[PDB]
Design a protein around this nucleic acid. Structure first.
Ligand SMILES: [Cl-]
Ligand SMILES: [Cl-]
Ligand SMILES: [Cl-]
Ligand SMILES: [Cl-]
Ligand SMILES: [K+]
Ligand SMILES: [Mg+2]
Ligand SMILES: [Mg+2]
Ligand SMILES: [Mg+2]
Ligand SMILES: [Mg+2]
Ligand SMILES: [Mg+2]
Ligand SMILES: [Mg+2]
Ligand SMILES: [Mg+2]
Ligand SMILES: [Mg+2]
Ligand SMILES: [Mg+2]
Ligand SMILES: [Mg+2]
Ligand SMILES: [Mg+2]
Ligand SMILES: [Mg+2]
Ligand SMILES: [Mg+2]
Ligand SMILES: [Mg+2]
Ligand SMILES: [Mg+2]
Ligand SMILES: [Mg+2]
Ligand SMILES: [Mg+2]
Ligand SMILES: [Mg+2]
Ligand SMILES: [Mg+2]
Ligand SMILES: [Mg+2]
Ligand SMILES: [Mg+2]
Ligand SMILES: [Mg+2]
Ligand SMILES: [Mg+2]
Ligand SMILES: [Mg+2]
Ligand SMILES: [Mg+2]
Ligand SMILES: [Mg+2]
Ligand SMILES: [Mg+2]
Ligand SMILES: [Mg+2]
Ligand SMILES: [Mg+2]
Ligand SMILES: [Mg+2]
Ligand SMILES: [Mg+2]
Ligand code: NA
Ligand code: NA
Ligand code: NA
Ligand code: NA
Ligand code: NA
Ligand code: NA
Ligand code: NA
Ligand code: NA
Ligand code: NA
Ligand code: NA
Ligand code: NA
Ligand code: NA
Ligand code: NA
Ligand code: NA
Ligand code: NA
Ligand code: NA
Ligand code: NA
Ligand code: NA
Lengths: 56, 337, 132
RNA sequence: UCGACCGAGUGGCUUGCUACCUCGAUGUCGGUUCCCUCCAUCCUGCCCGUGCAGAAGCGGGCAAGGGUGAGGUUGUUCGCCUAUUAAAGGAGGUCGUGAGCUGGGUUUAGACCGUCGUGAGACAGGUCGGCUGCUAUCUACUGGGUGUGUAAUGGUGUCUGACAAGAACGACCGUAUAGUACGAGAGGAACUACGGUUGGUGGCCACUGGUGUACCGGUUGUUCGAGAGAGCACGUGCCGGGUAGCCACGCCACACGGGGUAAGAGCUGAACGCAUCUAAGCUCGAAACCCACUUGGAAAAGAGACACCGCCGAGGUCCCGCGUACAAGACGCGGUCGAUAGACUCGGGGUGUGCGCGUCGAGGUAACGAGACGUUAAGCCCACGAGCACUAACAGACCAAAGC
RNA sequence: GGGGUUAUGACCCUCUUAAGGUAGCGUAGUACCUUGCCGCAUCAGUAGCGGCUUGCAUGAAUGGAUUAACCAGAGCUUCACUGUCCCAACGUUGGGCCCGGUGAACUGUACAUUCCAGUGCGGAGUCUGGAGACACCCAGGGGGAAGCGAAGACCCUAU
RNA sequence: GGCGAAAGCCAAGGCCUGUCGGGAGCAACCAACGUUAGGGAAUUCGGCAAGUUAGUCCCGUACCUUCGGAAGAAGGGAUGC
């Protein structure tokens, strides 16, 4: 079980959970949760969200 | 003209009514090929988590690689085989002959039975052996029960009592094997009957839904399009043709749904442990925390959390046992969130 | 067919309009049928990642339009499940036109392909720029 | 393989004939939904023949277990057409199904066109519009209770299995076999062993997804003087996020094998010294039958078995705290020798950084000032878990094993 | 209608019965054959539109053709949209369910626990043969009582 | 408030008499609704029902036409404090 960081909030993604979104250009984003995907979909940047490990 | 399509729901699980016994009763038992041994066990459902596993299937292209597998955690403390029952073969089939009881009892067992103060085991045992000599002896099973007081997450101290067959060996060796177990006080474990990687059949009484309609209960369609706005939404078209002029039991109708006995085949035992390894942060939701003897079952098991479930060795396995599969990871992540 | 090595929730139906990701000159494809697929009463024939589908060209060059061809679905928005449990989903739904031999009709693919599509069609994987 | 003429039939799905039933009314066509069936079999299983090399077929036999799907025109049935498919069979059930739905067509009252008529009007010709009542007495079934019988001694717990239900599984693609057998070549199998898909089935909720008028935040209008904090805006004002649970779009599981047969392939074998698969006997052989497996099942009137407890007392009901249960009833657990529910605290979660104060802030003499940063992973909140007898499970009440 | 003689068509006739369809429009809200034929459009279009058109049975105030604007008028196509559909789920409010109070109606020859077959005025809970069936009660969705409701509007008959 | 005798909210004034209540996370089923991933009319006689769009300002606006219209055509941008 290789542990990965969520490319959005930065917490460690629990093994056997979460979703990878493949972008149009082939770039790849691993999300730990729906909350993060949805926050991203609003065009919010994680560094600007105080609850986020990235921002902290 | 009217495309065909299969009927709604199976007719093999009927009548769909409330189970008379919340403790499931096995309809069948595995064959006698092996050495003498008790043919089942029981425990209490806790919840679900997942596991990372090493693929041991020799026929998979992924063999050796890691796989995520869902698991239902079941608390499986030791049980007590408190008596040995013998069945006589008769023209009417099998009938109980007599029983050999222990004198040694768990403190809570009187919440269920009227416990023997006076019993003569040797007389019973003699009656049995005489039967065997006559060749009338048809079956050997143990009257067993659980110890829910050993499972704090489960509110009951009252034990569940179930009869489990003893198979294997010659009849004589089997008889002795049974008697040996009982005399001790009958204490035995999940370890003793099952090994990780083996297939078990798991029986249980399902989550109760109370009264439900044919859409949920039988999987019939909802009314469609304009039909759905007319005053009918969840009702079937008709209860039958003009003739026969009566409603057939085969037409899907509302009624009790859930709280039925189910026996689910070929459940792989992933691990048989003890301790808090499987337990989830925050506690299993609506259950509690697991620290103690446990069994991990691949996938799902019938029943709600706290429900008694029963194990037996698979009577019709599709696959060879691959023993003791390697567990790389067990998720303790909160089931809340 | 050969196992995909992934569980798919089909995200497409008969009639769905999807992207043709390739240089064939077909831009938009309309799903018509799914290879090897049989449904049930009232069920819309469903297709997804790794399926071979019969297809109709709705948008593109005059010569490609109205043509009925075969294709392979290389991307879908509805998630799929990989053996480690994680889900993968794409930005669009996309298919690639293929001949009777499952060789791409075009010389180039546009955008990413799902890894599992290699377990099925080698020629399509080969022509891929990126595989995820 | 196709098969004329003529001859003999079977069905009761079309059409016609009859006028026996109903005119104090048995609601139409088509469709839909839901159930059962038939076989003259479209696919699937097992076979036979071939103008059977193989592959692909064609024709036939047994066989109704399962399947037989999605669309474009048309009210259509029918039929035509498209792409899929193993195949996309055909019938019966008041041309099954309006106290179920629909109401596009036929066939009311309005109107137009064509034709016919002096005309009112007509057509079986076309066309636009044109309504769908009822609180279920009986019966039937799906589920849920209360009683009685079994029982001139009750109870607790565990079983048995007469019978009953199931399709609990059906089908396809791919790989190895194998570019092999076969074949000049082109082309191109199988037994078996694997992997997956589809349709059906039963269950489950760690994962993904939906909901989530629990909750948290943002914000518009207005009212409570401002601030703070709130009400209303349809049963959340709107927008963003979303715990538990419930769910499917998510996840798990769902057969070997044996027995007896059909068609068929044979063995031994007469009648008929030979021959003969059949007459007696036997070996095999279908997705079909039986068993296996799952579900129900002591009211099985032969109304069952076992062990213990009890007949002044076993056990049960009521009561009280609850919920693995639930429309009433039922069911299950706990009741101080106790973690059953609540409080509290912690854990585990949701939201996203509270009020107030300090600093900054485009500017403005000033007053004033939208907003930024800090204090502050803050504040607020939880359907879950643990610790914990602090509160409440108190007090109790009752039935209970009949007579000569 | 029937006959003589350079797209639509031309002219002369005959017969009935006065004339013999001009300009147009045309498979029409008029076309039986009919899903006419060709084309557009669609994977596929008895639809729709355009062209053709011998028109079963078009046509000039029985007004012909055509037409901008208008329309809760009839048919068709496209973009957008979406629980109409695939295929259903969860939630909200009022009912439904239990309790106190109030409290009708429809309907009723009798009997009635039926089911499979048969028979019968040929469409039976009640006849016949079998099968099944211990009584009572709650909830349900409406298979049957050719269910309830209306002396059939259709059709014929009535001096 | 805003264009408004519009909506929404609130005074004055009126009312709790559009007059039966109590209980069960309150099941099936029904009325009237909200949300629903992916697909997007495949539904159906027919988009029936629902949904989409929306106020104001600037840009810009086709065929056709009885020159009046067509037109808010279409399409694009802006919008608070
Ligand atoms: Cl419907
Ligand atoms: Cl197995
Ligand atoms: Cl298809
Ligand atoms: Cl319909
Ligand atoms: K009549
Ligand atoms: Mg998560
Ligand atoms: Mg209606
Ligand atoms: Mg959870
Ligand atoms: Mg359909
Ligand atoms: Mg009737
Ligand atoms: Mg036959
Ligand atoms: Mg059948
Ligand atoms: Mg009918
Ligand atoms: Mg029918
Ligand atoms: Mg009816
Ligand atoms: Mg009706
Ligand atoms: Mg009614
Ligand atoms: Mg009509
Ligand atoms: Mg019409
Ligand atoms: Mg009409
Ligand atoms: Mg409100
Ligand atoms: Mg708005
Ligand atoms: Mg927090
Ligand atoms: Mg035409
Ligand atoms: Mg045509
Ligand atoms: Mg004139
Ligand atoms: Mg008769
Ligand atoms: Mg009788
Ligand atoms: Mg009359
Ligand atoms: Mg009349
Ligand atoms: Mg409610
Ligand atoms: Mg949706
Ligand atoms: Mg769309
Ligand atoms: Mg359609
Ligand atoms: Mg349709
Ligand atoms: Mg509408
Ligand atoms: Na209605
Ligand atoms: Na309605
Ligand atoms: Na009827
Ligand atoms: Na006839
Ligand atoms: Na009558
Ligand atoms: Na009908
Ligand atoms: Na069959
Ligand atoms: Na059709
Ligand atoms: Na009828
Ligand atoms: Na009808
Ligand atoms: Na009706
Ligand atoms: Na056999
Ligand atoms: Na009994
Ligand atoms: Na005329
Ligand atoms: Na008008
Ligand atoms: Na909806
Ligand atoms: Na009825
Ligand atoms: Na004003």
């Amino acid at each position: 079980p290789r542990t990965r960081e969520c490319d959005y909030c930065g917490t460690d993604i629990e093994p056997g959970t979460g979703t990878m979104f493949v972008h149009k250009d082939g770039a790849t984003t691993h999300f730990c949760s729906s909350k993060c995907e949805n926050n991203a979909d609003l065009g919010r940047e994680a560094r600007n969200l105080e609850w986020t490990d990235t921002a902290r | 003209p009217q495309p065909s399509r299969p009927r709604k729901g199976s007719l093999g699980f009927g009548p769909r009514k409330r189970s008379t016994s919340e403790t499931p009763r096995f309809n069948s038992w595995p064959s006698d090929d092996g050495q003498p041994g008790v043919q089942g066990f029981a425990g209490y459902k806790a919840g679900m988590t997942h596991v990372v596993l090493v693929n041991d299937e020799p026929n998979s292209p992924r063999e050796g690689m890691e796989e995520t597998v869902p698991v239902t955690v079941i608390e499986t403390p030791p049980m007590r085989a408190v008596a040995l029952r013998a069945y006589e073969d008769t023209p009417y089939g099998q009938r109980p002959l007599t029983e050999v009881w222990t004198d040694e009892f768990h403190s809570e067992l009187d919440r269920t039975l009227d416990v023997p103060e006076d019993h003569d085991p040797d007389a019973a045992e003699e009656q049995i052996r005489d039967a065997h000599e006559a060749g009338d002896l048809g079956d050997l099973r143990l009257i067993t029960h659980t110890v829910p007081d050993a499972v704090p997450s489960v509110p009951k101290k009252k034990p569940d009592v179930m009869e489990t067959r003893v198979g294997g060996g010659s009849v004589s060796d089997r008889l002795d094997h049974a008697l040996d177990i009982v005399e001790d006080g009958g204490e035995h474990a999940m370890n003793d009957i099952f090994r990780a990687g083996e297939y078990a059949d798991v029986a249980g009484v399902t989550k109760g839904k109370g009264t439900q309609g044919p859409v949920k209960r039988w999987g019939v369609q909802k009314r469609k399009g304009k039909h759905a706005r007319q005053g009918w939404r969840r009702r079937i078209g008709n209860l039958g043709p003009w003739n026969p002029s009566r409603v057939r039991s085969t037409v899907p109708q509302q009624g009790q749904t859930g709280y039925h006995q189910r026996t689910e085949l070929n459940k792989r035992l992933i691990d048989i442990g003890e301790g808090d390894e499987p337990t989830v942060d925050g506690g299993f939701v609506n259950y509690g925390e697991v620290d103690g003897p446990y069994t991990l079952v691949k996938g799902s098991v019938p029943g709600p959390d706290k429900r008694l479930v029963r194990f037996r060795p698979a009577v019709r396995p599709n696959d060879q046992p691959r023993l003791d599969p390697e567990v790389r990871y067990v998720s303790n992540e909160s089931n809340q969130g | 067919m050969e196992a995909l090595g992934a569980d798919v929730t089909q995200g497409l139906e008969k009639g769905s309009l999807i992207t043709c990701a390739d240089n064939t000159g077909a831009r938009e494809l309309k799903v018509i049928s799914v290879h090897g697929y049989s449904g049930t009463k009232n069920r819309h024939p469903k297709a997804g990642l790794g399926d071979k589908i019969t297809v109709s060209v709705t948008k593109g060059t005059p010569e490609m339009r109205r043509q009925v061809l075969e294709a392979v679905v290389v991307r879908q928005r509805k998630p799929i499940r990989r053996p480690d449990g994680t889900r993968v989903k794409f930005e669009d739904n996309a298919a690639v036109i293929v001949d009777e031999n499952e060789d791409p009709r075009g010389t180039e693919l546009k955008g990413p392909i799902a890894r599992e599509v290699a377990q099925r069609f080698g020629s399509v994987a080969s022509a891929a720029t990126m595989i995820v």
